[PDB]
Amino acid sequence: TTEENSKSEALLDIPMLEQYLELVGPKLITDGLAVFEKMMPGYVSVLESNLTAQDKKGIVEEGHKIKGAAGSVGLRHLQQLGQQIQSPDLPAWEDNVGEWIEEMKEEWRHDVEVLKAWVAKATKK
Protein backbone atom coordinates (compact mmCIF):
# COMPACT_ATOMS: atom_id res chain seq x y z
CA THR A 1 0.00 0.00 0.00
CA THR A 2 1.81 3.15 -1.19
CA GLU A 3 5.13 1.60 -0.09
CA GLU A 4 7.38 1.94 -3.16
CA ASN A 5 10.49 1.14 -1.08
CA SER A 6 9.92 -1.56 1.57
CA LYS A 7 13.66 -2.23 1.91
CA SER A 8 13.17 -1.74 5.67
CA GLU A 9 9.86 -3.54 6.34
CA ALA A 10 9.27 -6.34 3.81
CA LEU A 11 12.69 -7.96 4.36
CA LEU A 12 12.50 -8.21 8.16
CA ASP A 13 9.97 -7.81 10.99
CA ILE A 14 10.07 -4.24 12.36
CA PRO A 15 7.84 -4.95 15.38
CA MET A 16 9.21 -8.43 16.16
CA LEU A 17 12.74 -6.97 16.05
CA GLU A 18 11.77 -3.93 18.15
CA GLN A 19 10.16 -6.17 20.80
CA TYR A 20 13.02 -8.70 20.84
CA LEU A 21 15.29 -5.75 21.70
CA GLU A 22 12.86 -4.72 24.46
CA LEU A 23 13.40 -8.18 25.99
CA VAL A 24 16.99 -9.42 25.56
CA GLY A 25 18.28 -6.52 23.44
CA PRO A 26 20.93 -6.96 20.74
CA LYS A 27 22.23 -9.96 22.72
CA LEU A 28 19.65 -12.43 21.36
CA ILE A 29 19.44 -10.84 17.89
CA THR A 30 23.25 -10.66 17.59
CA ASP A 31 23.78 -14.13 19.12
CA GLY A 32 21.07 -16.08 17.26
CA LEU A 33 21.89 -14.27 13.99
CA ALA A 34 25.61 -14.92 14.58
CA VAL A 35 25.22 -18.72 14.46
CA PHE A 36 22.98 -18.23 11.41
CA GLU A 37 25.38 -16.06 9.38
CA LYS A 38 27.89 -18.85 10.12
CA MET A 39 25.84 -21.78 8.72
CA MET A 40 24.00 -19.63 6.15
CA PRO A 41 26.50 -20.14 3.32
CA GLY A 42 27.07 -23.77 4.36
CA TYR A 43 23.30 -24.38 4.32
CA VAL A 44 22.69 -23.15 0.75
CA SER A 45 25.74 -25.20 -0.28
CA VAL A 46 23.98 -28.39 0.86
CA LEU A 47 20.73 -27.07 -0.65
CA GLU A 48 22.14 -27.06 -4.20
CA SER A 49 24.10 -30.24 -3.39
CA ASN A 50 20.84 -32.14 -2.74
CA LEU A 51 19.19 -30.38 -5.71
CA THR A 52 21.41 -32.41 -8.07
CA ALA A 53 20.51 -35.61 -6.17
CA GLN A 54 16.84 -34.60 -6.47
CA ASP A 55 16.52 -34.60 -2.66
CA LYS A 56 13.15 -32.80 -2.54
CA LYS A 57 11.82 -34.02 0.84
CA GLY A 58 15.26 -33.27 2.32
CA ILE A 59 15.40 -29.77 0.78
CA VAL A 60 11.84 -28.92 1.90
CA GLU A 61 12.73 -29.79 5.52
CA GLU A 62 15.91 -27.69 5.40
CA GLY A 63 13.71 -24.98 3.85
CA HIS A 64 11.28 -24.17 6.69
CA LYS A 65 14.02 -25.26 9.12
CA ILE A 66 16.66 -22.70 8.07
CA LYS A 67 14.48 -19.88 6.68
CA GLY A 68 12.39 -20.31 9.85
CA ALA A 69 15.37 -19.92 12.21
CA ALA A 70 16.63 -16.74 10.49
CA GLY A 71 13.06 -15.36 10.55
CA SER A 72 13.34 -15.46 14.35
CA VAL A 73 16.12 -12.85 14.18
CA GLY A 74 13.77 -10.68 12.07
CA LEU A 75 14.55 -12.37 8.73
CA ARG A 76 10.99 -12.64 7.36
CA HIS A 77 12.24 -12.50 3.75
CA LEU A 78 13.83 -15.95 4.09
CA GLN A 79 11.14 -17.30 6.44
CA GLN A 80 8.76 -16.80 3.49
CA LEU A 81 10.98 -18.26 0.74
CA GLY A 82 10.96 -21.56 2.66
CA GLN A 83 7.28 -21.27 3.67
CA GLN A 84 6.68 -21.61 -0.09
CA ILE A 85 9.44 -24.17 -0.77
CA GLN A 86 7.28 -26.50 1.38
CA SER A 87 4.94 -26.92 -1.62
CA PRO A 88 7.14 -28.72 -4.16
CA ASP A 89 3.98 -29.74 -6.04
CA LEU A 90 2.79 -26.59 -7.87
CA PRO A 91 3.18 -26.94 -11.63
CA ALA A 92 4.95 -23.56 -11.61
CA TRP A 93 7.05 -24.15 -8.47
CA GLU A 94 9.05 -27.03 -9.99
CA ASP A 95 9.92 -24.48 -12.70
CA ASN A 96 10.40 -21.45 -10.41
CA VAL A 97 12.50 -23.20 -7.75
CA GLY A 98 15.68 -22.45 -9.74
CA GLU A 99 14.87 -18.73 -9.40
CA TRP A 100 13.86 -19.29 -5.76
CA ILE A 101 17.20 -20.70 -4.54
CA GLU A 102 19.17 -18.17 -6.63
CA GLU A 103 17.26 -15.15 -5.27
CA MET A 104 17.35 -16.52 -1.70
CA LYS A 105 21.17 -16.60 -1.70
CA GLU A 106 21.64 -13.18 -3.36
CA GLU A 107 19.10 -11.50 -1.04
CA TRP A 108 19.02 -13.18 2.39
CA ARG A 109 22.23 -11.41 3.50
CA HIS A 110 20.75 -8.00 2.62
CA ASP A 111 17.70 -8.71 4.82
CA VAL A 112 20.08 -9.49 7.70
CA GLU A 113 22.46 -6.51 7.48
CA VAL A 114 19.22 -4.48 7.38
CA LEU A 115 17.59 -5.77 10.60
CA LYS A 116 21.05 -5.27 12.16
CA ALA A 117 21.37 -1.55 11.36
CA TRP A 118 17.77 -1.12 12.59
CA VAL A 119 18.67 -2.38 16.08
CA ALA A 120 21.74 -0.10 16.17
CA LYS A 121 19.41 2.75 15.12
CA ALA A 122 16.09 2.06 16.89
CA THR A 123 18.06 2.06 20.17
CA LYS A 124 17.12 5.75 20.54
CA LYS A 125 14.44 7.98 18.98
From Swiss-Prot:
Locations listed in the record: Cell inner membrane
Superkingdom of the organism of origin: Bacteria
PTM statement from Swiss-Prot or TrEMBL: Activation requires a sequential transfer of a phosphate group from a His in the primary transmitter domain, to an Asp in the receiver domain and to a His in the secondary transmitter domain.
Effect upon mutating residue 64 to Q: Loss of activity
Phosphohistidine: residues bearing it: 64
Domain HPt, chain residue ranges per copy: 25-118
Role according to the record: Member of the two-component regulatory system ArcB/ArcA. Sensor-regulator protein for anaerobic repression of the arc modulon. Activates ArcA via a four-step phosphorelay.
Protein name as it appears in the record: Aerobic respiration control sensor protein ArcB
Gene that this polypeptide is encoded by: arcB
Shown part of the complete sequence: 654 to 778 of 778
